């Protein structure tokens, strides 16, 4: 009984890590379409000439 | 008992995917606490990767 | 009798306390103060 | 501890009853604390899983991006080719 660890620190740290991964993931989707729309404009720019 | 097991089935938060398990000493508690630390270490390692 | 019997028991469950017992243990703090009280009993005997 | 030989059995029984009710309390509060850690670990595990279902979508966006890069490269490599074929 007297040898019971707490673990809420590790379970906070993992939660915060999973919010950092979510924040990077949504940046990654914006950074994906910023490139994909940029390359689409380079195609329409060629299509006429 | 049968009465104790009827309670274990009637308070299960999802009977579709969860099995009820008894603990009856601090040995049973820590035979599950060490598996929370086992799961915490694995859950961090897949979050960091 | 009590304190020897608890360390005899902790070393029988094989239980690594995750809060490791503070170092040195509080009975070693008390053993060193038990040497002081004998030392000062000798000083107060010399002076008598 | 070995029981002290001077103690009354009445004292020893009341001492042990008090300690078993102290241990009964702390067993339920420690087990309740373990149960809160189950949910926090299970919800963080569900959070990680639902992000992995979206890593599969990032891999789809890289294939879409690679296709745009392949198409613009050879639209440019066809424009140079048709300019050389007009110029000549």
From Swiss-Prot, chain B:
The lineage of its organism: Eukaryota, Amoebozoa, Evosea, Eumycetozoa, Dictyostelia. Contains FG repeats. The chain holds residues 246 to 294 of 440 of the full protein. This is Nuclear pore complex protein nup54. Probable component of the nuclear pore complex, a complex required for the trafficking across the nuclear membrane. It comes from Dictyostelium discoideum. It is found in: Nucleus, Nuclear pore complex. Belongs to the NUP54 family.
């Amino acid at each position: 009984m007297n040898s019971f660890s707490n673990y809420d620190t590790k379970i906070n740290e993992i939660s915060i890590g999973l919010d950092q991964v979510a924040s990077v993931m949504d940046n990654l989707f914006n950074n994906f379409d910023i490139h994909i729309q940029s390359f689409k404009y380079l195609e329409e720019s060629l299509a006429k000439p | 008992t049968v009465d104790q097991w009827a309670y274990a089935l009637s308070n299960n938060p999802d009977p579709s995917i969860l099995i009820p398990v008894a603990a009856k000493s601090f040995d049973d508690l820590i035979n599950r606490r060490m598996k929370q630390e086992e799961t915490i270490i694995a859950l961090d390692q897949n979050t960091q990767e | 009798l009590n304190s020897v019997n608890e360390q005899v028991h902790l070393l029988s469950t094989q239980f690594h306390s995750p809060f490791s017992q503070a170092r040195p243990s509080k009975e070693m703090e008390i053993i060193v103060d038990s040497l002081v009280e004998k030392i000062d009993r000798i000083k107060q005997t010399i002076l008598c | 501890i070995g029981i002290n030989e001077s103690k009354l059995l009445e004292q020893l029984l009341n001492e042990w009853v008090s300690e078993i009710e102290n241990q009964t309390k702390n067993f339920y509060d420690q087990a309740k604390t373990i149960f809160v850690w189950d949910q926090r670990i299970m919800d963080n595990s569900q959070k990680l899983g639902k992000l992995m279902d979206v890593v599969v979508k990032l891999n789809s966006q890289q294939n879409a991006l690679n296709q745009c890069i392949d198409v613009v490269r050879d639209q440019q490599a066809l424009l140079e080719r048709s300019l050389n074929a007009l110029d000549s």
